Amino acid sequence: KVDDAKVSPPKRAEMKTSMESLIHHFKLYTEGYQVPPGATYTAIEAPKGEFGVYLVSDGSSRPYRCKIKAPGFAHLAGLDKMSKGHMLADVVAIIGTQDIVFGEVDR
Amino acid sequence: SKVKQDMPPPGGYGPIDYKRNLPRRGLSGYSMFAVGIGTLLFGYW
């Protein structure tokens, strides 16, 4: 983990011995690291698509807005376009070829 | 004591294959057909 103890908890051995580790561990596990104000749209190559998060921080220790980019959301949106002229067994094939998962497509 | 964690072996792990290794089994189409009539013609005799 990052050696910066203000963003990552210190080691247990140091937390029980050194002051700075203990006081940081106490406040990190009661407030959380203060994130500067701003917004970001980091997105990684998810196994489906481009799962990303539009994190928006107000500067406090808690986030303000965090909207989840779901590749399934677009894929399920296009499901209407995919199924056209195909039968009821084929739409069963399509909704699996996009690998729709409903905690993510739905949030 | 020196630092010890989970590390790769000094020579490194073996070569990990990833390509297709699909076997080429069976026999020629002519031979498969010629067998088909071969036992078939036996049948009518």
Binding site: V2, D3, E31, V35, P47, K48, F102, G103 | -
Partner: protein, 108 residues
């Protein structure tokens, strides 16, 4: 439905069995995840992303982790990134395993 891949209301307006309209009513599972995100701290917010998609466990908070510390102008140690990509690829295997097999399940 077992072919529903979980929960959703997919209404088909079909003649014979040719689907004419396939309106996918979604939200049958809806949890206000982003709303509870607002009230929890970033550390408390980490488990939320682990439960977005049930196919990729740590591919998700990898995005969430990348969201925070890159906004924080902080970078992870080089060894940690190698663990992340190694398990992210293992996680990539995790989804693809039933991205194809459960596909075949509904297929037959």
């Amino acid at each position: 439905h077992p072919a529903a891949h979980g929960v959703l209301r997919l209404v088909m307006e079909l003649s014979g069995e040719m689907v004419r309209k396939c309106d996918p009513h979604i939200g049958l599972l809806h949890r206000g995840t982003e709303k509870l995100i607002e009230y929890k701290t970033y550390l408390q917010a980490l488990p939320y992303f682990d439960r977005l998609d049930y196919v990729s466990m740590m591919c998700n908070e990898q995005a969430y982790s990348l969201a925070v510390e890159k906004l924080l102008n902080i970078q992870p140690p080089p060894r940690a990134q190698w663990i992340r990509v190694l398990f992210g690829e293992i996680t990539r295997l995790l989804n693809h395993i039933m991205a194809v097999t459960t596909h075949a399940l509904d297929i037959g």
